[PDB]
């Protein structure tokens, strides 16, 4: 909302576990971060297969969406990488 640079220092973490925020939207830059923890971004979601996640995410809760760990994240490169995929598989997929 204001002073986005204050969060740029919060993404300096590495090796912790965060959760996807619902404050963001699909097909418009998916962002995944914590209230004061790290923050992520994904502009590649601007393509989508057929439907927009704007609705699928509208069903989630406050701060609910996904769950993973943040190991590498750049505010200038906008490159976010999680280890949730290396941690273990799952019975479902987002």
**Distance (Å, whole) CA 58 – CA 73:** 26
**Distance (Å, whole) CA 57 – CA 22:** 7
| Experimental technique of record | NMR
| 84 contact partners, CB below 8 Å, separation of at least 6 | 67, 68, 69
Strand arrangement of the beta sheet that strand 80-82 belongs to: 16-19, 67-73, 80-82
């Amino acid at each position: 909302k204001a002073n986005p640079w204050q969060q740029f220092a919060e993404t300096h973490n590495k090796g912790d576990r965060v959760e996807g925020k619902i404050k963001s939207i699909t097909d418009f830059g998916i962002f995944i971060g914590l209230d004061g923890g790290i923050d992520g971004l994904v502009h590649l979601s601007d393509i989508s297969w057929n439907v927009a996640g704007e609705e699928a995410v509208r069903e989630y809760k406050k701060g609910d969406e996904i769950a993973a760990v943040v190991l590498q994240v750049d505010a200038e490169r906008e490159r976010i990488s999680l280890g949730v995929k290396q941690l273990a598989e799952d019975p479902f997929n987002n």
